[PDB]
Structure formats: C-alpha cells, structure tokens
From a paper:
Carboxylesterases are a family of enzymes that act on a variety of both exogenous (e.g. cocaine, heroin) and endogenous (e.g. acyl-CoA esters) substrates. They are defined by their ability to hydrolyze ester, amide, or thioester bonds to their corresponding alcohol, amine or thiol and free acid in a diverse range of chemically distinct compounds. Carboxylesterases comprise three distinct domains; a central domain containing the catalytic triad (S221, H467 and E354), a regulatory domain (RD) and an α/β domain. The active site occupies a 10-15Å deep hydrophobic pocket at the interface of the three domains with all three catalytic residues arranged such that a proton transfer chain can be established.
The structure-function relationship of this aglycosylated hCES1 was explored alongside the wild type enzyme and a catalytically inactive mutant (S221A). Here, recombinant hCES1 enzymes were produced in HEK293 cells using either transient expression (hCES1 N79Q) or from stable cell lines (hCES1 and S221A). The HEK Gnt1-/- mutant cell line in which N-glycosylation is restricted to GlcNAc2Man5 was used for generating stable cell lines. In all three structures, the asymmetric unit contained one monomer of hCES1, containing, two disulphide bridges were present, C87- C116 and C274—C285 as seen in other hCES1 structures. In the crystal structure of hCES1 and hCES1 S221A, an N-acetylglucosamine adduct was observed attached to the side chain of residue N79. Space group symmetry was used to generate the biological trimer that is seen in solution. Superposition of the monomeric structures showed no differences between the glycosylated and aglycosylated hCES1. The orientation of the side-chains of the catalytic triad (S221, E354, H467) in bound and unbound enzymes was also identical showing that the enzyme is pre-disposed for substrate binding.
Author numbering: 21 to 314, 318 to 552
The structure:
C-alpha cells in the first residue's frame, strides 16, 4: 500500500513495490542508493569516501547514471545482457557510485535473508548495475539481491604505477559497496553474516580479485565467478604501467613530466574531455598497427593487491570462503569477437593467418610470439579443413582467456582447503541475439539469463528454458545459503575436490570430472618452456 521506507546509516530511503507472478508478497526495490561520496573533482583517482548524510527521505525509485563510458558500447552490452523485457537507457555520469536493492522480505517483519551482491562485467570499461533486474532471483529464491556500480575505464583504473595514482579505484569502489552492505543490509531484511559476491566476466575477475585482497576481509562469506577470474590475463597488468599512463596523459593533452604532474592535469579535465580521450584510446578493440605487446585494468597496486594473483595463490593467505567458479562451453563463440570487431569475418581460417592473428591477439591471450606456432599447431594442426580450424581457433582463445585460468584458480582454491565448485554451462538461450549463429551454444554471457530469471521477465521461453532458470537460481541461492549448491529436487553437484567433479549445466544437467584437464596441462607446460 504505502511505499516502503528504510533507515540507513546516512539517512532514510524510499523505495517501491513490484509484484512478480507466482508470489503474493511484493518485492521492495530501492534504486540509486549512494554508497560513497560522488568522486568528482579532486576525488578523481582517489579511494571512495563515505557518502555524506542526508536529511529527510531520499527518493530511491529511479535508476542512477552509469559510470562514464563509451555510450554506444555500453548500451549495446546492456541490450545483450539484460534480463528485462526492455533495456533501460541510462545517462552517463562520474556521479555513479550507487547500488540497487531487491528485497523480497516483508520489511514489517523480522528477516535475515542471504544477500547476493552482483558485480557486472564489461571489461572494466563499460557496464551498469541497472542492466540486471534482481526481481526474479529475489522472489524465486528469497534472497536479497544487490547490484553495484564501480568506476570504469580511466576513472576506475588509471594508474601511474606509484603512489600518485596507484590504480584499482573501481575495485576499491566494490570494497566500499561491500562495506556499505555490512553496515546497512539488515535494514533491508538481509543477513550481513551471509553475503555472497557474484559476478560475470570482468565482474567474475573482480570477485576473484576480492578473494585475494586483504581489504575485502570479513565482507563476504561465499563467492561466485562466472566466466572470469584473476588469472584472466587480459584484465590484469603485470610489469610497467607507466607507458600506458603517459599515453593516456598525452592523448588528454597533459604533460608527462612527473606522475604527480600527470595526475594533477588529468584531474582538471572535464568528464567530456576524459570521455573523448577514452574514445581516442580505442580500449575494447585490438590495435591495428605495431607491436601487439603494446589495455586498462587491474594492477598490482600495493593496497588492494600486494602481489600478483599467481604469487598470492601460492601463499594461501587469501579468503578461503566457499567458491564457485564456472565457464561457458563456447566463451569466444560470438558475443566477444563481435563486440570487439575482432578481425575474422570469413568463416574459414588457414594456419598462417591463424598465427598472425594470434600474435595480434596478444592483449587478449598474452601469448609470446615464439610460442605461437606451437600453440596454433596444437589446436589447428590435426585437420586440413579450414572451417574446422576456425572453430578450433575460437576454442583456443576461449581456453586461454577463460577455461584454463578458471581451473587453475579453482585448483588453488581447493588446495588451500576451501570448499570449491565448478560448472560448465552449455545452453543457447532463446534470448540470444537473432544475429548469433544457431550453432553457438554457451556463448559468453549465456548463463546470465538463467541466473537472473529472464524467463520470468522476458517473453518466449520454452518449458525447458523456464525449468533451467529455476534450477540455476536454486543452485546459486542454495550456495548463498549453505556454501554448497545442493538440495532436494536438484541434480547432484559434486565438490571440486581431488577428483575434480564439476556440473555440466544445460538441457541435460549432469556431473562430470576433470574439466579442461588436458588443456591446463598443455598451456601450463607451454608457458613454462
Ligand atoms: C519519487 O520519484 C519519482 C520519479 O522517479 C516520482 O514520480 C515520485 O513522485 C517521487 N516521490 C517522492 C519525491 O515522494
């Protein structure tokens, strides 16, 4: 009747009710709650500060701006990934440190429901919380769903490699949002003692990063990485970040005399100017010319990450929470290459062209030139059919970006004594772009529709697709509840232990063993030549 009003640490918020078919209790939704001070002016390239408190009742019933980003690419990704019947257009702003809350709890009664905090993907460059409607997951599984934003691109990841601009601002924003959830979620019927972080692609990489960061201690109790981990190398910069910083500075019209001079100049630029610079840098496509070894992202900054992910894994001081790590069958099948304008159009590929392409693909796969013939031969050499070569080439890219890093992370996590689970998702959603070939199954992002209940929001899902979403949401929420996805009515999902059991999720969901085992061996041996 009366819209719901909730006390938070910094003031009161007003949300709205939305009913979902099948559920008598409306879900209370609060959109655009700030969890930090807007990072404007001198606060650019600094850690997020607490939000300033507000008087009276803040109206939390409209979607916030998305963090500044290429609007064309951001809109396109939102349209492709949204679980909503209609994509919600968003404004851009630097003032973007907001989260959205979907709580199925009757807030007039006592509730301490599991909380699931969603970290969106988009390469650390694009993306928005508001793409993901929490309504269906929250109602079907009785969990509080929180979708967060974090600074993107230059704003989120500009690093001088030193104390004048350490980097990882967007990850610090993710931490700040988690701190806010600890301090406030009980007011929305959530249990701050049961917080599950989950995310896809760059969001899954962020989750994996958080598992490795001391700054995230006591902020979550389970984790889920979907199609991205901290060994997804395209997102993690090792070695010297100064040349990139200088390139950004120069492109923005700034001198490079010192790091502090660069950062000061960049802090005087307008949002418009930094977006112009962003677009000039071409951050989500491959460089046409010159050395492939010459992207923005996560760095080893000394505050969030003290050493490389590989070193932190070997040390097992990371957070040994229950962790679910998964991939999709064909991660490089359609969506990623299409969004990147990846330079492969023909539908066939000879081996010479494959080798040159894999070198030009260095930013994505990080494969040294001397290793390229041996890698290309492994995947493509067994067949003289150039169509088949092309499909195997897409498998090559997927395995290096996603499957191999995911299994290495899951193995290290298990070996530290943490409960670990894996999956491979193999289904082609009806919600796919009708420009995607009918034969691409388990593309990057295809699991999103199941996790977020798209069959309950969008039109056209088959009986099988409806049931697949129910099953997936239930596994995810059981994992949030118990650190173990299993429950009555659901296929058995083995623990990822020394037998390396994992779940093959799709139309016929069943357990299997030793996901990507032969691929991990191949690549690990190759990279150690
Ligand atoms: C809250 O915001 C909506 C627009 O998003 C507006 O229509 C509504 O009247 C507002 N309610 C207030 C300020 O009480």
């Amino acid at each position: 009747s009366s819209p719901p009003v909730v006390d938070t640490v910094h003031g009161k918020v007003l949300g709205k009710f939305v009913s979902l078919e099948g559920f008598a209790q409306p879900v209370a939704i609060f959109l655009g709650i700030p969890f930090a001070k807007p990072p404007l002016g001198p606060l650019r390239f600094t850690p997020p500060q607490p939000a300033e408190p507000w008087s009276f009742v803040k109206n939390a019933t409209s979607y916030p701006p998305m963090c500044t980003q290429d609007p064309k690419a951001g809109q396109l990704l939102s349209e492709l990934f949204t679980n909503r019947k209609e994509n919600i257009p968003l404004k851009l702003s630097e003032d973007c440190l907001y989260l959205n809350i979907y709580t199925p709890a009757d807030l007039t009664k006592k509730n301490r429901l599991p909380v699931m905090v969603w970290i969106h993907g988009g390469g650390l460059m694009v993306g928005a919380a508001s793409t993901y409607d929490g309504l269906a997951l929250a109602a079907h599984e009785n969990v509080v769903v929180v979708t967060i934003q974090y600074r993107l691109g230059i704003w989120g990841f500009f690093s001088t490699g030193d104390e004048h601009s350490r980097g990882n601002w967007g990850h610090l924003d993710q931490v700040a949002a988690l701190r806010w959830v600890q301090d406030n979620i009980a007011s929305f019927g959530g249990n701050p003692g049961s917080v599950t972080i989950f995310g896809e692609a760059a969001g899954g990489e962020s989750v994996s990063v958080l598992v490795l960061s001391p700054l995230a201690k006591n902020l979550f109790h389970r984790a889920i990485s979907e199609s991205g981990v901290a060994l997804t190398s395209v997102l993690v910069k090792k070695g010297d970040v100064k040349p990139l910083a200088e390139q950004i500075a120069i492109t923005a019209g700034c001198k490079t005399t010192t790091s502090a001079v660069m950062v000061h100049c960049l802090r005087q630029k307008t949002e418009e100017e930094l977006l112009e610079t962003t677009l000039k840098m071409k951050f989500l496509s491959l460089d046409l010319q010159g050395d492939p070894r010459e992207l923005l992202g996560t760095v080893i900054d000394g505050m969030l990450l003290l050493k490389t992910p590989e070193e932190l894994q070997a040390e097992r001081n990371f957070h040994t929470v229950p962790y679910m790590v998964g991939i999709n069958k064909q991660e490089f099948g359609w969506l990623i290459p299409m969004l990147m304008s990846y330079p492969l159009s023909e539908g066939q590929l000879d081996q010479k062209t494959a080798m040159s392409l894999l070198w030009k693909s260095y930013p994505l796969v990080c494969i040294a030139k001397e290793l390229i013939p041996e890698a290309t031969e492994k995947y493509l050499g067994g067949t003289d059919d150039t169509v088949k070569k092309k499909d195997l080439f897409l498998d090559l890219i997927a395995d290096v970006m996603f499957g191999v890093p995911s299994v290495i992370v899951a193995r290290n996590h298990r070996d530290a004594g943490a409960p670990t689970y894996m999956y491979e998702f193999q289904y082609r959603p009806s919600f796919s772009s009708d420009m995607k070939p009918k034969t691409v199954i388990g593309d990057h992002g295809d699991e999103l529709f199941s996790v977020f209940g798209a069959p309950f929001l969008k039109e056209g899902a088959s009986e099988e697709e409806i049931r697949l979403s129910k099953m997936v949401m239930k596994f995810w929420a059981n994992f949030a509840r118990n650190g173990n996805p299993n429950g009555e009515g659901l296929p058995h999902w083995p623990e990822y232990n020394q037998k390396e059991g994992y779940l093959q999720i799709g139309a016929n969901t069943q357990a299997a063993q030793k996901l990507k085992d032969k691929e991990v061996a191949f690549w690990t041996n190759l990279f150690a030549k």
